[PDB]
Design a binder for this molecule. Sequence first.
Ligand SMILES: Nc1ncnc2c1ncn2[C@@H]1O[C@H](COP(=O)(O)OP(=O)(O)O)[C@@H](O)[C@H]1O
Ligand SMILES: CC[C@@H](O[P@@](=O)(OP(=O)(O)O)[C@@H](C)N)C(=O)O
Ligand SMILES: [Mg+2]
Ligand SMILES: [Mg+2]
Ligand SMILES: [Mg+2]
Length: 306
Amino acid sequence: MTDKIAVLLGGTSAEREVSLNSGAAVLAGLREGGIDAYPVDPKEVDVTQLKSMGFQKVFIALHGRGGEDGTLQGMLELMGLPYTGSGVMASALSMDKLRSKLLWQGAGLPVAPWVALTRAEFEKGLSDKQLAEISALGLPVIVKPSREGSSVGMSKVVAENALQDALRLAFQHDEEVLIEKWLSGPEFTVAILGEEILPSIRIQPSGTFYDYEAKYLSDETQYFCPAGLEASQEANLQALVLKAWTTLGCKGWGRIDVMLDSDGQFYLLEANTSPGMTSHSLVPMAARQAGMSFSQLVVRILELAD
Ligand SMILES: Nc1ncnc2c1ncn2[C@@H]1O[C@H](COP(=O)(O)OP(=O)(O)O)[C@@H](O)[C@H]1O
Ligand SMILES: CC[C@@H](O[P@@](=O)(OP(=O)(O)O)[C@@H](C)N)C(=O)O
Ligand SMILES: [Mg+2]
Ligand SMILES: [Mg+2]
Ligand SMILES: [Mg+2]
């Protein structure tokens, strides 16, 4: 009441349906929690008059460019309205798998070997000497859109001959793409809440990689929380997650995907400043384990709104 909360759902990313699913759930969650929440789809309502509508706070239940980079946040900040996660810089940093990577590697964080390509270097004919780059990475390699979420445009390329196409795709989603070494080890994600870190979740997709279908439309996907990892490696995780996180400048709430390599080490894949909150999403899982309910999480997330 008075404190009319706005849950920004959908928008126009490639993640819009997931977004809409998050919003619907956070909307419920905030309402069970006793907050006057509102479905504000930026794909209709001009989020600029958000100030004019009487909202006192905003819940970013949006995923991707338009909603997860520093764009909206910049607005909100100038409007004078608090929002739920990572500031302007940590939102723009996180959304760039390419820049998030150089900063992490910059600070000596365990980042996977990559090779960036732009679309312009792409429609030219990458040096038959730029493959020297890419093939010194090994086989396979996973090619991905720089600024995407929910495993969009990603394509595993086993063999140099399967790359050109892996790239056409990734490229239909961005002009800067990262080609990286395939990590042969379990897949992990850690969730941050305030300055706390929820129990670790080990994902086990029944496919090749935690693809789009695996993340949302699949029941084969196995979820282990915590990781059932030894208290050594477990300590190494949080440690690394928080490092890679403060290095980014992120706050309030977020989630980091890491995976193991044949080397025994942890490799930061990427970071998320507006994580999913669907009936399949990871944050929600991390929290229930930490004995919280969906309205406690979503509500605690708002308590952090700045
Ligand atoms: N280096 C890698 N080796 C193997 N699989 C990888 C690698 N990087 C990412 N993947 C797979 O791709 C998925 C999406 O990777 P991620 O970088 O988190 O992108 P997104 O923004 O789509 O969430 C990961 O959950 C993992 O399943
Ligand atoms: C199940 C995967 C996860 O999705 P995201 O938060 O992370 P991701 O980019 O690695 O997929 C997603 C909504 N961007 C989620 O909803 O829990
Ligand atoms: Mg991101
Ligand atoms: Mg992502
Ligand atoms: Mg991921």
